[PDB]
Curated annotation (Swiss-Prot):
Residues 15-331 form the Protein kinase domain. Its EC number is 2.7.12.1. This is Dual specificity protein kinase CLK1. It is an enzyme of class 2 (transferase). ATP binds at L21, G22, E23, G24, A25, F26, G27, K28, V29, K45. GO terms for molecular function: ATP binding; non-membrane spanning protein tyrosine kinase activity; protein serine kinase activity; protein serine/threonine kinase activity; protein serine/threonine/tyrosine kinase activity; protein tyrosine kinase activity.
Length: 338
């Protein structure tokens, strides 16, 4: 796909490529000048010409047509799709241009976490956006910091002596949600596997059936990452991930081990887990109870951790909904009267 385009090329007789914004297994996103919209800069996702990504792209176009007509002012912060077309047999989707992902920001900030005031604002907007999907019988299923994009990524920089780090701070942390190629309607077939290892809910790993609550799980994991700069589940292995969940959040509920067909993770009613193995020693060093990750015992940190704990409830029915999350005390500060 280096083959099919480059800087200076004009796509669909109107979109002049001026930059490549990023690349992925999924394809790439380029920045274009739209010569038929007064020179508006747009993002064009150019989809890898592979069955999986083609199918996801057609699905994304259908979901965004739905969300974007349902919410034409983008009150709920889903990215606006402008149109789509084909280029050398690749699907190309045109979006309003957004800045870099929250992942890429953290990376470019030397994996320093966001300060709590920005986490509060971003968390509220993510919950509100993803709650709009949940209001429209949709589950995103692949939420991650890479899929949350800043509207504008201008920042200030200052030495912080506390951590002896130069630190970037966004001027405006407003976000939009992207990547609707895995989004699943309530009445559609639910894939066995959904989500990216570090954000997968326990009911997904244990194949107990998933729906909107698996997005809540993902968002709790995203907020921990925002807070720390790193995932608290640093693994790609499902069984190790369960072992990390057990160290950070406590024992899996007996009713989830009882029901699961994923007997390969278990020995009787316990995780089939050797604490003394390489992976066992890594899990014991790397993981600890959730509240031990708090950087401050200040009440605003307790409030965030209270919300994260509710989002990381194992039972997906008990798990806080995003409608309830938007009412959580952590967001009181956002509701202080002007
Ligand atoms: C796994 C994630 O997949 C993505 C990722 C980004 C998108 C977009 C999008 C829509 C509007 N504006 C942008 N801007 C953008 C800006 C960047 O730096 C300034 C970097 C990137 C990137 F290429 F790395 F993704 C994108 N991206 C639409 N769909 N997706 N699907």
């Amino acid at each position: 796909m280096h083959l099919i385009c480059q800087s200076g090329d004009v796509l669909s007789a109107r979109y002049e490529i001026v930059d490549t914004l990023g690349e992925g297994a999924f394809g790439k996103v380029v920045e274009c000048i739209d010569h038929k919209a007064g020179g508006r800069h747009v993002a064009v996702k150019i989809v890898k010409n592979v069955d999986r990504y083609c199918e996801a792209a057609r699905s994304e176009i259908q979901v965004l047509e739905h969300l974007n007509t349902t919410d034409p002012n983008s009150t709920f912060r889903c990215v606006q799709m402008l149109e789509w077309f084909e280029h050398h047999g690749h699907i190309c989707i045109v979006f309003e241009l957004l800045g870099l992902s929250t992942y890429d920001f953290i990376k470019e900030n030397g994996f320093l976490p966001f300060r709590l005031d920005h986490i509060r604002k971003m968390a509220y907007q993510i919950c509100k956006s993803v709650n709009f999907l949940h209001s429209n019988k949709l589950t995103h299923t692949d939420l991650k910091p890479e899929n949350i994009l800043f509207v504008q990524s201008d920042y200030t920089e200052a030495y912080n002596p506390k951590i002896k780090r130069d630190e970037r701070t966004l001027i405006n942390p407003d976000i939009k949600v992207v990547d609707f190629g895995s989004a699943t309607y309530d009445d559609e077939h639910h894939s066995t596997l959904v989500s990216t290892r570090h954000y997968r809910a326990p009911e997904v790993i244990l194949a107990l059936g998933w729906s909107q609550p698996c997005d809540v799980w993902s968002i709790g994991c995203i907020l921990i990452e925002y807070y720390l700069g790193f995932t608290v589940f640093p693994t790609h292995d499902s069984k190790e991930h369960l072992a990390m969940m057990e160290r950070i959040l406590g024992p899996l509920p007996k009713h989830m081990i009882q029901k699961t067909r994923k007997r390969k993770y278990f020995h009787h009613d316990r995780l089939d887990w050797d604490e003394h193995s390489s992976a066992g020693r890594y899990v014991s060093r790397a993981c600890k109870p959730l509240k031990e990750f708090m950087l401050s015992q200040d009440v605003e940190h307790e409030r965030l951790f209270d919300l994260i704990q509710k989002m990381l409830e194992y039972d997906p029915a008990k798990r806080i909904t995003l409608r309830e999350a938007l009412k959580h005390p952590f967001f009181d500060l956002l509701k202080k009267s002007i």
